[PDB]
Amino acid sequence: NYALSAQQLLNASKIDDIDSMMGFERYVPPQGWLTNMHATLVSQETTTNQGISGVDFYFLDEEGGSFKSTVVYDPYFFIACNDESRVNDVEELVKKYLESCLKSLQIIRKEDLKLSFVNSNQLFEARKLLRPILQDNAHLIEDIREYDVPYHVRVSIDKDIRVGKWYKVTQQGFIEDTRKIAFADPVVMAFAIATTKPPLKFPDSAVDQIMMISYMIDGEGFLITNREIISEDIEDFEYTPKPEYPGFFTIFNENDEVALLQRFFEHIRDVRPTVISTFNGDFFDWPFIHNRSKIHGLDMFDEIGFAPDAEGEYKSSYCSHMDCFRWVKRDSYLPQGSQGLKAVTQSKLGYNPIELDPELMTPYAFEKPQHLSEYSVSDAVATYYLYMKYVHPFIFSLCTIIPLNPDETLRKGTGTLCEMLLMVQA
Amino acid sequence: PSVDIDASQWQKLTQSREKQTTVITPLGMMMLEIQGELELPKDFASLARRDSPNEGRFSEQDGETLIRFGSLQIDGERATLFVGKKQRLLGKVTKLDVPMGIMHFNSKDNKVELVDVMKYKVIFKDRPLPI
Amino acid sequence: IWVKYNEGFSNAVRKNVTWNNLWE
Amino acid sequence: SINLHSAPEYDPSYKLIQLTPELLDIIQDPVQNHQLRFKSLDKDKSEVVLCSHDKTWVLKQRKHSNTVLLMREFVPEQPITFDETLLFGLSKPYMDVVGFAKTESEFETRETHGELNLNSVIGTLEELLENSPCSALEGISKWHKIGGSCILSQDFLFKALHVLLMSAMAESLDLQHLNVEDTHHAVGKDIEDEFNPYTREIIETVLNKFAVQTWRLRIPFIAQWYGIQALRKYVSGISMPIDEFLIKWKSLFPPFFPCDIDIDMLRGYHFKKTVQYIAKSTLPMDPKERFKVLFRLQSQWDLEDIKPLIEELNSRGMKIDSFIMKYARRKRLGKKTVVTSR
Structure with missing residues (x-):
């Protein structure tokens, strides 16, 4: 029984609730600048229910507000035939053979630039039924083509929609505004955490605690402090290493770890970022934050809509996770010897950031908290302005031509990016 | 207490004299700076009597015994300082980012008068060499 | 007559000024 | 070349003062002399400032390790004659200069702010602005303010x-x-x-x-000031509901000249459906504890009623909204962005 249908619909509905809580209600035009998109499943609203596959597109409006809108589309893949004269016999076989999964089928002889399905699960069941027949052929059934189009990609391609361009959402569909080219300005948050660790060992989130989190929001700095560890209240100060890089930091001296976490999540809800950037946050920052969140009985997915995906990476629907380290490794053209935050700062931003031996970070928390906090905020300044000056234009412009969200265009192999471009042109 | 800065004489002299050409200010004033201590004799009067015509080390100006202690040679930004008969120092004429005003504090009347403005300086940061 | 060369150059940290510092 | 001469004794009255472009222009102004003034309070303790008609700069002395010798051009009473044995690197001497002073420190000027000295018979106002670390305009403004x-x-x-x-x-x-x-x-x-x-x-x-x-006539200043005095006279003891105390406060008035009320005038000198007087100079000068006690006074605050209550406190000079989110946490509603803390 398709009891997993209803669970994917529950996850979809929780994501809808997350989206509406952060200011992206579903707009349905009568009978925006696009910043993200994700596949989803939706119930009838426009005696067996399972839901309709489609894609959510997230828009920022011209008035400083935001909304989301939804496109429905039948997923489809094809079946080739080695004998055209008998294609009709194949049709009769599969019409019957695929009755349990198939939504419709269409014959085409010669075109220029077909089995449709109700949702991605049914497509995948069709593939599971067809795979043994293709493996055995080492009934005339030719193999499927080389390519595997992701459903969200399939919609982005077929509808000719790209993040970074402007659209009017209408009953007819999305209409590109070729008159507007200058990008809108997302709310951008960049953050770096500082944590405890044992002498000569690595931080371990099972026992070590977060002592500070620094971040920047649209050019304004914030530093949150855990006073169970930092032995005095830190005061407000300015760190601006070049006029290009202003840094006014506001301090939140919290009594303990949970308060620091709650100020962080609540402030995030307050500001509603649609980009969150880190440096190696997929391997360090995010799992650590997640584990301390769990330790205090908080549910990060419920709090701000971020959760780990199948790769162990931390993703949300409404806000891109821009790990600058991924761009450094793939696109910066820097040698691995210069892939540290220090060397990237010197190479790309043209100045020399604050340096502190990691073994000294825990003791200074007690003994010299201002110096440790200057290091932390220097990290946050470098990461914020690295993102704004280098990562943001590049990734978003790439999104304007590649049928992917920022996360994927940042993270996919260059081979897969080429594959996607070639798939689009065909 | 309080007292005003008198800049009438400096203004009159600046307006009446030509524009600055070299490092020497229009008022006929310069700055020499040496990374070190200028060791001069403690008794000018005694050595002025021992001064020979060949040395020409001492002279009288307005009742004060002046010692001729060196020579300065300006080659653009580069500068060379001869001290005594046996010392040569290499340095540069550098523009100070914040100009300095010379102010004479006349203790008698507690009056302050603007004397001149620095307008570049001749500084010597390298070890003196043989002549 | 000579110059005792200082190997380098140091400027001390800026200090506050009282009335007696100007009129000694 | 230039012949170099030194006086056996230098005058310590000459002192180097740093020149900012604005001071450099005020001094190089031939239309009005005596536009700068070395002001200070006493004769052995207080700092020294240089004031124009509207600005103020503090003096800061910085010593250095170099020999800085001031030189002047003179005319020799007798011709300077000496054998130049060195033939390479020295041109014929055509000018003579003498060291008249030896400065081992510089005097820097950085813009600053002033206060009045209300210690002490002074007699006139020029003698009070005399022995006070302040300029002219700021001094008369504060003298009018007090x-x-x-x-x-x-x-x-x-x-x-x-x-x-x-x-x-x-x-x-x-x-x-x-x-x-x-x-x-x-x-x-x-x-x-x-x-x-x-x-x-x-x-x-x-x-x-x-x-x-x-x-x-400064109508708002006088009317609001009188209202603050009425606050000091009535709700300096008891709190009262907003309406009844608005009635009893509005009942007190100066003579014939009328006074209009506004939500802005009724803000910055009381606290709350209640109302009681409060003063700014009596709160704890520490920011975190000040916001703590303020949050302990009212469960809910108003934006217009607390905005003038926090602008003078924090001296960072940052934006108002940053100041607000900083030591506290917002919680807006439909009408006006109000604030609470847990």
Whole structure:
């Protein structure tokens, strides 16, 4: 029984609730600048229910507000035939053979630039039924083509929609505004955490605690402090290493770890970022934050809509996770010897950031908290302005031509990016 | 207490004299700076009597015994300082980012008068060499 | 007559000024 | 080349002062001499400033390790003759200079701010702005702000405001053009001089306190000020609901001149459906504890009622919204962005 249908619909509905809580209600035009998109499943609203596959597109409006809108589309893949004269016999076989999964089928002889399905699960069941027949052929059934189009990609391609361009959402569909080219300005948050660790060992989130989190929001700095560890209240100060890089930091001296976490999540809800950037946050920052969140009985997915995906990476629907380290490794053209935050700062931003031996970070928390906090905020300044000056234009412009969200265009192999471009042109 | 800065004489002299050409200010004033201590004799009067015509080390100006202690040679930004008969120092004429005003504090009347403005300086940061 | 060369150059940290510092 | 001469004794009266472009232009101004002034309070303790007619700079002395010798051009009383044995690197000497001073420190100028010295007979105002670390304009502005004349106490300055308003309205004095003579004659018209402390200086003081100069009328300043005094007289003891205390406060008024009320005037000097007086100089000067006690006073605050209550506290100079989110946490609603802390 398709009891997993209803669970994917529950996850979809929780994501809808997350989206509406952060200011992206579903707009349905009568009978925006696009910043993200994700596949989803939706119930009838426009005696067996399972839901309709489609894609959510997230828009920022011209008035400083935001909304989301939804496109429905039948997923489809094809079946080739080695004998055209008998294609009709194949049709009769599969019409019957695929009755349990198939939504419709269409014959085409010669075109220029077909089995449709109700949702991605049914497509995948069709593939599971067809795979043994293709493996055995080492009934005339030719193999499927080389390519595997992701459903969200399939919609982005077929509808000719790209993040970074402007659209009017209408009953007819999305209409590109070729008159507007200058990008809108997302709310951008960049953050770096500082944590405890044992002498000569690595931080371990099972026992070590977060002592500070620094971040920047649209050019304004914030530093949150855990006073169970930092032995005095830190005061407000300015760190601006070049006029290009202003840094006014506001301090939140919290009594303990949970308060620091709650100020962080609540402030995030307050500001509603649609980009969150880190440096190696997929391997360090995010799992650590997640584990301390769990330790205090908080549910990060419920709090701000971020959760780990199948790769162990931390993703949300409404806000891109821009790990600058991924761009450094793939696109910066820097040698691995210069892939540290220090060397990237010197190479790309043209100045020399604050340096502190990691073994000294825990003791200074007690003994010299201002110096440790200057290091932390220097990290946050470098990461914020690295993102704004280098990562943001590049990734978003790439999104304007590649049928992917920022996360994927940042993270996919260059081979897969080429594959996607070639798939689009065909 | 309080007292005003008198800049009438400096203004009159600046307006009446030509524009600055070299490092020497229009008022006929310069700055020499040496990374070190200028060791001069403690008794000018005694050595002025021992001064020979060949040395020409001492002279009288307005009742004060002046010692001729060196020579300065300006080659653009580069500068060379001869001290005594046996010392040569290499340095540069550098523009100070914040100009300095010379102010004479006349203790008698507690009056302050603007004397001149620095307008570049001749500084010597390298070890003196043989002549 | 000579110059005792200082190997380098140091400027001390800026200090506050009282009335007696100007009129000694 | 240049012949170099040194005097056996240098005059320590010469002192190097740093020149900013603005001071460099004020000094190089041939239209008005004596535009800068070395002001200070006493003669052995206080700092030294240099003030123009509207600015202020503090002096800072910095010593260095170099020999800085000031040189002047002179005309030799007798021709300077000496054998130049060195033939390479030395041209014929054509000018002679002498060291007249040896500075081992520099005097820097950095813009600053001033306060008045109300220690002590001084006599005149030029002698008070004399022994006070401040400029000219700031000094007269603060002297007008504190109601000085000596310094009038609050009770006497505000009984003088009341009697002044009564006399000005009784004689139908023109609101647009007022002078000290007409107002002084209006005050002491039917009263004797032995029992008339309201001399012309007191009238000018009340004018400069509640108006600026004829002295233009500052209606909001005077009306709101009187309202603050009514707050000090009524809700300095008991709190009361908003409506009944609005009635009882509005009931108190100066003489004939009318006063309009506003949510802005009724803000910054009381706290809350209740209302009670509060003063700014009495809160703890520490920011975190100040916001703590303020949150302990009201469960809910208003934006217009707390915005003037926090602008003077934090001295960071950052934006207002940053200040607000900083030591606290917002919680807006439909009408106005109000604030609470847990």
